């Protein structure tokens, strides 16, 4: 009854930076060739979406944000072969076109069709499927999940298990997979190692989950909000430290605690200074540091390259290094088989209409993941 | 005639920065417990030794520099078990104590007994074996090879094949092993890959040798001195580019040539700007960049962490990542078995007394490696 037709629905439109989202009616065009229109079931609030509001992450406005979500296919455009109406799906903020040099590389996952490096805020064809008050509205990372319906390119959606609980598995679309993969796939944490995790939000807790799964003997959580420590220990941290408690810089503290530096460190905040601190606290000859946090737009850090010359490895990754369309269904299957848990990340649940309250909870430090239900 | 006694011999003393080496008589104490006195045969002129003269690398002065060398054991102190009088040896500017956490780690080679991080310019016991004009003279990296005799700690010397040609294998003490290992062990260049090498001196040519040995399909040499290109092609470069020939920054040129970025890049110069350019020119999702060059003392580079967040890996290494005492004898044996060539690196051979002329050849751009003979 809606196939081929414009759908009018509610969405959370961001008209300008540093303002509440506006819950109001938008028009969602039907999918074109190789596009998929999705009815949203649940979406999480990730710090990246707040970065859009704050101007930390620059993408064209006005915009429908949201990128960590799950829903049910409402209709498919001409030529779609990988999903069907009625399928449960997770939108992929990093596409997997399967044809570019990165998709063909055994390690790479940052597909060249991404909308991150040179943000356009469009579908792959350079146009928008959203109208609001008669005005075109930008997409976000080819997902735009803060809406009752969205349209994504086929390379930006994965079919998942038909029995999946969408109010939980939406976290596999961003925060869980990012943190878990950063530990198990990017860093390749080893049994018996010592790890340090900077930032104990949804993504940092997922890093801890991955470090424990990889068998780390010590996992040191680092956060300036000590209210985050109890859940960090629940999911695997052996000891938590607040940098504000110490007179010395925390990388000196962590080097002392690890008897000369940690094996693996992770920056999961998004600050230039903590990226450098995290690199410095890994052991100078064989340590590995992974950047996960998003830096403020266009800003450069400063560092002494002797930190690298002694032997450190420094790297970063999007989405935990996972090839998105191959990996998301497998991660869902693994969740259904109880191989990892998502409940520890979910601290609050709200209806989509209370999106602004959900962002207030994030900004206040009270929440990890709030899940919004449509 | 000389065991247990002070040796008066010729050495090249550096009394202060930015002055020629002073060829004069020095006095070399006999070895104490666990020390080894070596009567040098050949020593190479490495850019690192020039960095001491120029103030790029800070180490206590006055000093006997030189660290890339080979000689013959004159005497051993109490407790030495790994070499004997008459053995051919190569001093190790990175020690291998075998006891610290780095030596025990499968990947690490930057032994915690090194004299680089906190330069003292002494023997392990904190004292000097050198006097000149009645003044104590500092050691350099526990080697000090610009002298007819030196004294090193046992952890800083390796015994090598009694039939080795010392006037060639001295290069295994630094330049060859550093460059070759940076490609084959640190970067782990893969066959069919595309590589970019910034700096075509002795170390950069050794990187090229390693990239070719690893089966790279394309090896792009980068140098502002085009006189370096002919030898780079002889040892495996498929193409050479001079940044000053182009209106665009060279990272953009290299990204275009490689159809979107190289697989492996190497900075083998020692400039902050080329360290960042080398990182930028590897492919953003799966590229690897290795810093080999020595940066100017205490200076920080500036970089955008988005270069790492997309997926790049940035690392550095001392001595090609080789565990020094284990690897040097094996590299000499490999040379004797004809597994790699050293002659392409040697452009000049001069008597030790012509040390200053040898440094003039390096500074003028004319030489690769000058070997000084005693
Ligand atoms: N690389 C990727 O693919 C992805 C990156 N991100 C980024 O990861 C970061 C974390 O995301 P979430 O976990 O949702 O964020 P979050 O805000 O829930 O967690 C961040 C934690 O860092 C702590 N923190 C803040 N400043 C600190 C400081 N100076 N020192 C120590 N701790 C400090 C906060 O108290 C907070 O608990 C964000 O920057 C986000 O944009 C998120 C998802 C995917
Ligand atoms: N990491 C380690 O273990 C080691 C590091 N090193 C360092 O490696 C570096 C290279 O050593 P060598 O080969 O002996 O030096 P070299 O001076 O013979 O070679 C350097 C090359 O860089 C080129 N160059 C200079 N500025 C340039 C620019 N802006 N762009 C492009 N090319 C430029 C020069 O023309 C020269 O050919 C030095 O900094 C040295 O201290 C050396 C040995 C061991
Ligand atoms: O949180 C999801 N996506 C992020 C990934 C890191 C760059 C900004 C967008
Ligand atoms: O060239 C020999 N040794 C160098 C290695 C890099 C740091 C300075 C000393
Ligand atoms: Zn996210
Ligand atoms: Zn692709
Ligand atoms: Zn050691
Ligand atoms: Zn050297």
Curated annotation (Swiss-Prot), chains A, B:
Zn(2+) 2 binds at residues 97, 100, 103, 111. GO terms for molecular function: all-trans-retinol dehydrogenase (NAD+) activity; zinc ion binding. The keyword S-adenosyl-L-methionine does not apply. It is an enzyme of class 1 (oxidoreductase). Zn(2+) 1 binds at residues 46, 48, 67, 174. It comes from the Eukaryota. The keyword Ligase does not apply. NAD(+) binds at residues 48, 199-204, 223, 228, 292-294, 319, 369. Belongs to the zinc-containing alcohol dehydrogenase family. Class-I subfamily. Dimer of identical or non-identical chains of two types (E and S) coded by 2 separate genes at different loci. This is Alcohol dehydrogenase E chain. It comes from Equus caballus (Horse). The lineage of its organism: Eukaryota, Metazoa, Chordata, Craniata, Vertebrata.
């Amino acid at each position: 009854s809606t196939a081929g037709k414009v759908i009018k629905c509610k969405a959370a439109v961001l008209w300008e930076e540093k303002k509440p989202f506006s819950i109001e009616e938008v028009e969602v065009a039907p999918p074109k060739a190789h596009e998929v229109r999705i009815k949203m079931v649940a979406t999480g609030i990730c710090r990246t979406d707040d970065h859009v509001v704050s101007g930390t992450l620059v993408t064209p406005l006005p915009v429908i944000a949201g990128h960590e979500a799950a829903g049910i296919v409402e209709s498919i455009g001409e030529g779609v072969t990988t999903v069907r109406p009625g399928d449960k799906v997770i939108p992929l903020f990093t596409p997997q076109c399967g044809k570019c040099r990165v998709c063909k590389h055994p390690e790479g996952n940052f597909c060249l069709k991404n909308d991150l490096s040179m943000p356009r805020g469009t579908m792959q064809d350079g146009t928008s499927r959203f109208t609001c008050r008669g005005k075109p509205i930008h997409h976000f990372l080819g997902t735009s999940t803060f809406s009752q319906y969205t349209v994504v390119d086929e390379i930006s959606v994965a079919k998942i298990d038909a029995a999946s609980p969408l109010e939980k598995v939406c976290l596999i679309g961003c925060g869980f997979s990012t943190g878990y993969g950063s530990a198990v796939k990017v860093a390749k944490v080893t049994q018996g190692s010592t790890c340090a995790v900077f930032g104990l939000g949804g993504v940092g807790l997922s890093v801890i989950m991955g470090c424990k799964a990889a068998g780390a003997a010590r996992i040191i959580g680092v956060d300036i909000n000590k209210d985050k420590f109890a859940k960090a220990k629940e999911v695997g941290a052996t000891e938590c430290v607040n940098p504000q408690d110490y007179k010395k810089p925390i990388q000196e503290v962590l080097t002392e605690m690890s008897n000369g530096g940690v094996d693996f460190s992770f920056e999961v905040i998004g600050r230039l200074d903590t990226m450098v601190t995290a690199l410095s606290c890994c052991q100078e000859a064989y340590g590995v540091s992974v950047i996960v946090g998003v830096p403020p737009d266009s800003q450069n850090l400063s560092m002494n390259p002797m930190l690298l010359l002694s032997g450190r490895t420094w790297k970063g990754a999007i989405f935990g290094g996972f090839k998105s369309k191959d990996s998301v269904p497998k991660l869902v299957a693994d969740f259904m088989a109880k191989k990892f848990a998502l409940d520890p990340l979910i601290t609050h649940v709200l209806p989509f209409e209370k999106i602004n309250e959900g962002f207030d909870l994030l900004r206040s430090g009270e929440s990890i993941r709030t899940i919004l239900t449509f």
